User: Fold Prenyltransferase from Streptomyces sp..
Amino acid sequence: EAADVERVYAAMEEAAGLLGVACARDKIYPLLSTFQDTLVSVVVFSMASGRHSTELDFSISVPTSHGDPYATVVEKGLFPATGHPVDDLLADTQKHLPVSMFAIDGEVTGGFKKTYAFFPTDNMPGVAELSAIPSMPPAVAENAELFARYGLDKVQMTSMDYKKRQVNLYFSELSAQTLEAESVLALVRELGLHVPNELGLKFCKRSFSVYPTLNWETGKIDRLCFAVISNDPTLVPSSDEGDIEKFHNYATKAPYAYTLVYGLTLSPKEEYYKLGAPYH
Assistant:
C-alpha cells in the first residue's frame, strides 16, 4: 500500500519532531518502500539521551521468508558493503541457526545502520552455539567465560551494527541473582564501564534483558545495556529533570497504530538511556 508507506513516514516525522530532530527523506524512504509488502510487521521508534538526544532509530521487522534483509539493501544499492566480516554475519546466523524473524533499522539523518537476528522463544541459543559462527567476532568466544560467571547464557536475539562493525547479544532468561546490586557492580567494574547509582541498579533489578556490545578489533566489550519492558511511561533511570521530562514526553506522545522498552546503556565514559516506542 502507498498510504502505509507514507503513513509510517508521516508518523516517523511526528516522533522525530518531539525530540527536535529533522528527518532526511533522502536516506529514509528508499529503504521504507523496498520493504513495503511487510508494512501491511513490527515497526519501532527509539530515542537516546545525552549527547545522543539528537539521534533516533527506527526498527522494522522482516519475516525470514523474505530472505536476508541486509543482502537486499546492498544489492539494491541502499548501503555499500564494507568488505568486513559484519557483511556476512547475518547470513551465517541463519546458515548456522534457526532464525525465525529478521529486522532492519536506520537513523533518521544517516539512513540504514543495523539489522537484527531473532531467535525462537522455544529455542534460544547459548554463547557456545553463537561462537561457532565463522563470521562472529572472536570476542564472543573470548568472553564466553565472563558471560557464564554472571549467568549470561540464553540469547534472545542479536543485532549487527554495520557502521560501527558491532554485534549486540541480547541475553535473556536471566537469573534473579544476576541482576542484583552486587553482581551488577562487579560485572560493570570488571568490564571497565560507567558505574550506575542507586537508581540505575534499581532499574537493572527490573531488567528482562542485558545486552553487551562487541566488535571485531579487540576482546573488549564496548558497552553493555540493560533493557526494561513496561507500560509505565515514567521509568527512565535518570534523576536529571530534563531526561525525566524528555523521556516521559516521548513515551506519552509517541504515535501508535494499535508499550515501552527502556534502555540503560553503560559506556566507558558516560551514561545514557534509550526508549523504544513501537508503532505495531
